[PDB]
């Protein structure tokens, strides 16, 4: 139960670094290079909005920030100043990380396809649109799912270790 | 009344982080991707100005800065150097946060629609225009309203605790 | 006369923060989204230059920097090292802030209109041009005038307090 | 065996500096200046995605971050607090760097050509496309391969020195 | 001779701040908004290059950096460790600042006109071109000349004070 | 032999500052404002690549970083902890700086012309292309050559002083 | 009753000549120079079709041909070969010319306006369109109405003369 | 049975004149003003070809020429030179005119709609296209059907008169 | 009085030939090459219509046809079949030709200028437009006025000869 | 053998009329509406030239003119003025018409496809192009083949009748 | 003096045929393919009008018509009905043809250059423009001058023959 | 010598018909579909003028008209009214037709290539241009040469027959 802590800390820092340094620049051109075969004004806007409601990078930043709140609470408490608080914050972290992983699976799945079929007003009937960087975005998706799985496993390990 | 303080501090820091890190980049393309069905020069400018008089991110930055002024005053006083000042600053913070929440509701409501109908000069009669990222902007609106509600509840809690 | 100092310091810091964080990005697209109804090359340049000779944000940065010079002089003097210097620097600050407020009123007034009428070479006769974000720019103008008025009042207060 | 350590540290810092300061700006225009001889919408997207699945700079940042994890683990352990850990981390670093060099060779090779032949839907039959900055990108490839080879040699040196 | 030093330091810091914070963004669009009445490829490039050989902001940054070298030399000497060095560095600073002011006058003069007449290959005969932001650039020119004049006067003051 | 050290340090810092602050922004538009008289797709890419294989700013950053490696080695050695190392590092620095100056002369020469003649596929026969900011780039070239010459002279001075 | 015949023949020939020689070339550009303020494909087609269902020149050619049929019948009869036929053909000509004049008034009126307001699918709401050569077309309308009135009067004259 | 001949001759000449003088110029812009909402090359060609396989004016010219062949045969026979030939040619004319009227009904129907829905390669799925002058073309269709009906009735009249 | 008749006939035939052979092709591009400096849709149409209400060639064809009607009347009378008719038709021809010459002078004057100033809706304020072939059109105007003057003189000659 | 002559004359006149009146206007837009999916200048020209070397209408006019030469020769002979000439001209006409029918089959076949695949310089590899009015052109081809077959049969009939 | 008449008649008919059949189609694209290097609206119109005030074909048609008037006068006289009239008409024809040849030389000269230099408002300073078909137009000029010279010689021959 | 006359007349009429009916419409788009790979204004004009100085159809019309002049002279002579004139006109016709055939060979040769290489001002160095309908134009060239050869042979036949 000694190394588990060390590896959890290392995984957390690794995830933060990967998200902070490179992820902001794969998605930079997401809408400027999204294009549809049509002459109707506003169809690109409607179809992009329907294909990508919340961007991956926004979801990941939110998750990263929200999984660090129990630690901040514990730190503020101790600064004003314990084991019951430790138990409760561990429970809360476990719950939050399982919820976020499940939500990721339900929102995005495991792949980003290259074509999208759209039927939203003002587009006439169904139109075909084309995505930017699908392979790189799929690789990023899979990597993030793997890291979050590792973190879930480790936190369950420690929860069951204490009992 | 002990945990309330800790959670108020955590909510404040969380709100600042969310606004500072991601909000500047959802709104970056607000006017460059706003488009209207027309051939008249200046109609896009007039209709964008009428649809979005003050941007959300500007309003939120202003609110965040203004709700931290009583603390700065108290700090400057103590550095020159109390309970009466504490009472007064708590009262002022309560008033300011209720005012800002009410103003948010009256300025923006609870949703951002995808279409807008415009009848401002130099546009001839009424024209139809199309918005960028309405779903993401609606999600952001709802999240910010929820956070500000939490803060209002907590500050009223402490006000009534002291009495 | 005790609280006046504290509120002057708070107003100064508030003004600096508002100018530094948001003002650089309302004006970013000032000339790229300025457009005139014409086919003559160079008319957009001439009409933009005649409508907006010095930008608001440039004027405000200059004013903010210039109203902090007496403090720097006093600090450098004391570091080399007094009441006469205090008197003189208070007088100078008062004069500078009244001059800057008067100049603001004479340069810009109280509103930014949406249309502008231009008759400068190489434009043939008179042409009509269209401005970006007039409502937001008007709001910013009014807010800055109010803050500077508050500062003027406080400094006159202290000047007359000492006498 | 004394100088080997010093030169390994110098090589690592040199590599980090070269990657961090200049590499982000050779690749900035990679897709905006990629062009194909065609009139079909979406062909540029499909052909760019097939020619460049993962960008060099992304691969190099990932490798740089991943080769520094054993040191972070050792530091965290000692802070909580050894020779067995030293042995294991040396072994792991050796393995990781050999794996990354082999993967680089298998993904990219030793050159970036100026022409690319594409046959992916929606492109009709085979089309010809043109790359940006091939000579500079080839120079960067060769330099990075050389540096990583040096690092591999040094780490094997020390592994065999201890035995 | 006491206040002269203080005001010289204040003028130097003021000049550095003005150059560093705002000057980089008046000149940002210098070539993208330069336009000529012609259909010949390469004429805009040739005429811009002939009208503006070295940009003002480049000249000012170079001057600012070069007028601070004697101080760095004196500091490095004292750290290794005097009045003779003080004399020599004062002389050198005086000479450098007079040279730079004279060069500014000879390179640029006192105004930036709105029209420019060009006769360089590949332009056929003489063509007319149009400049961006001439009034703002003229204001900046005059302000910088005034500041440099103040600095020259003060340094001559101190030189003649010591003798 | 005392002042030589001081001036070498000052020259090195001056060179680093000049390269770091301004050079990144003269070359920013190098390819976006490069244009050729042709209707063939891909000719601009091929001709730009043949005219400018490695950019000046990349070469200068690499040289600056590489001429500081012996100092880092000496520092790391002393931290683990000498005159023999001093001798060797002086020799190495001399050699590296002479090599880099010779390479600069052989790669670029002393001027940047305004026209370039290109005959690379897919361009049909020979075409004429036009360069951005040739005068400013020539000035930068000459300045950098002068500085590097000064540094070479000083290092040879000290090498021969010790002997 | 003698001159009436002569003038009827002269009016008929005059009308035929005017229609045949010039009318085909006022209307030649009717749809190519019809333009609407819109970006919607197909709106110009729908609005032109609704504004001008049958062109004037088509209506006039049809009328001219149809008012000459009784004469052809009488000629064919006499060639095969009477007063009863004369009576009947006079009656028929009278009826046909009164019908055609009434239909002209009910289809077109007395003027062609320069603006037209359109609300047909696929146009969004109401749009404004602009007509070619309205003054010339109005002059032609009035002239043709006058000529047809003269012819009606003369034929009624002769009908009542015989009785 | 006397007038029937005269009216048949008059109807034939009237039909020829109407077709020859005006019909060539309603259809002149049939394909140049046919437009579809799409960005795919070749879709306009495929959809126009599927909507209008043989033009009305071509069909009518062919019919007019083919219904005059028996007369030419009879004339050539008599010039070389009968009642049996008269009978046979009357029979043939009757048959030909009934066949042509039936074919007209089966090819075109009674109206020309303003919209057409197309699903032919290379068009992606179904697209919407817009027709030129539908009301005028419908009027022409109905008029021609009426005239041909009159001719059919008259020829059957004479066939049954002889028996 | 003998040659006057011959020359009148020759002048009439000459005028008809000049109008019929060349005049239809100077005016062919009248509206396609008319251009105004503006970006407003419909302004070219409104300004062309206001500058040229009835084209010269239309006016001249109408005049030529109308001055030949008395001859046709006299011919038809004589075919049915005198000096009184001769007198009356001479009087009528004189009156018609004087009326047409006066109307020409009042409609068009003696020149066609190259510039036109327009202030009709939808044009904003006053705009400048440019005419096609003004010199050729002026030459044609003057020639036609001269010919019509000759004809007027001759007809008055004969009228006064008979008395 | 009596009717054969009459029907041959009727077929010849029918063919001439069909070719002369309508065929010139199906092919009018043959090259202006021919389009290929490419960005290479000159590819449309090369591919159109390879797909349609000699146009159908040119071939048919040439054939029609050449099959009437023996008659002109016989007429000129008789005007200067026989059975031997009749025999020879019949033989020649038979041969010419069989040759022309065979050549038609070998040049064009029985259909015009909608797509064409092109691989001629300057087109890169193989490109796809799209044809105008293929169904109408196929109908015309089949009709002309049928008529020419009828003529061949009749002329062989008469040749074998005389023997 | 016998053949001179015959050759004069043949030359006249030849000239009429050459002018009537081909000259109308060399000049058809005179203004549509005239182009100037400029971005100013109206400059093409002004420069074309100044370069070509009256077109060659207009001048030649006018001359051809005017040199046939004496014959028409003589014919009309004889129809009403001599040697004195013959003399006078010969004199007049001689004078007219010499005048027209001299005017041709003074208006046009002997060549049409490919470049033209223009300095008319609204063109800024002097601009360069490019002509269509200069070699063909020069050939036509020379041919017409030669023919008119032949005619002048022949008419002088006959004038001096009679005396 | 009897049939030779008949065949000469038939060949002449055949040639006139072929030239008059079809040749005017192969060359109609000669310059509108001529295109060069360049961005220089005026290069298309200069290169078209250098490639095609006099068009084939112009040359052929001129030749056809000029080879019929001796017949017109003989006809005019006989109308005023011989064997000597017959001899002379035969000689002249022979000479004219041989001259025209030789000139055709020297001006045009036997083929029209698809590419042309141009080096005329204002084109920079050498450019490549592309021709319209080369195969059809080559076929026309060869056919016309063959016909003119036949005519030459026949006229020499008759010349030598008389002797």
């Amino acid at each position: 139960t000694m190394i588990g802590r060390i590896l959890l800390t290392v995984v957390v820092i690794f995830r933060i670094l990967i998200v902070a340094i490179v992820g902001e620049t794969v998605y930079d051109d997401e809408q400027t290079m999204f294009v549809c075969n049509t002459l109707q004004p506003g169809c690109n806007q409607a179809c992009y909005d329907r294909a990508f409601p919340i961007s991956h990078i926004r979801y990941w930043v939110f998750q990263i920030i929200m999984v660090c709140t129990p630690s901040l609470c514990f730190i503020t408490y101790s600064v004003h100043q314990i084991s019951r608080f430790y138990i409760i914050q561990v429970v809360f972290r476990n719950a939050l990380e399982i919820g976020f992983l499940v939500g990721q699976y339900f929102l995005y799945g495991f792949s980003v396809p290259g074509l999208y079929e759209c039927n939203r007003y003002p587009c006439i009937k169904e139109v075909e649109c084309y995505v930017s960087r699908p392979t790189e975005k799929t690789v990023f998706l899979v990597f993030m799912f793997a890291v979050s799985g590792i973190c879930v496993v480790l936190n369950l390990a420690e929860l069951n270790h204490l009992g």
Side-chain angles (χ1 to χ4, degrees), chain A residues 124-138:
Chain A
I124 306 175
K125 287 162 300 231
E126 167 176 306
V127 300
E128 197 169 84
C129 304
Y130 312 97
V131 181
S132 171
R133 302 177 197 262
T135 307
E136 197 153 53
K137 289 166 179 162
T138 297

Side-chain angles (χ1 to χ4, degrees), chain A residues 8-32:
Chain A
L8 188 55
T9 294
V10 167
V11 165
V12 161
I13 299 157
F14 182 79
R15 176 218 261 153
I16 289 166
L17 287 165
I18 290 302
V19 168
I21 300 169
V22 70
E24 273 83 7
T25 186
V26 169
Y27 295 85
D28 178 78
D29 59 33
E30 45 208 344
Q31 173 167 229
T32 294

Side-chain angles (χ1 to χ4, degrees), chain A residues 69-133:
Chain A
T69 296
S71 312
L72 290 172
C73 291
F74 179 83
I75 289 313
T76 313
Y77 173 83
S78 309
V79 155
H80 281 165
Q81 185 62 32
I82 218 168
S83 274
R84 213 193 176 145
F85 229 70
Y86 194 75
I87 301 310
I88 302 274
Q89 71 140 30
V90 166
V91 171
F92 270 83
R93 201 166 63 216
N94 276 69
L96 279 177
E97 287 227 346
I98 289 172
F100 272 111
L101 188 67
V102 171
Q104 190 178 323
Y105 172 72
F106 271 117
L107 264 175
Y108 301 125
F110 289 118
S111 74
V112 176
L115 309 161
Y116 181 74
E117 305 88 358
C118 184
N119 73 312
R120 217 158 86 165
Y121 178 92
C123 314
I124 306 175
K125 287 162 300 231
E126 167 176 306
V127 300
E128 197 169 84
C129 304
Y130 312 97
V131 181
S132 171
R133 302 177 197 262

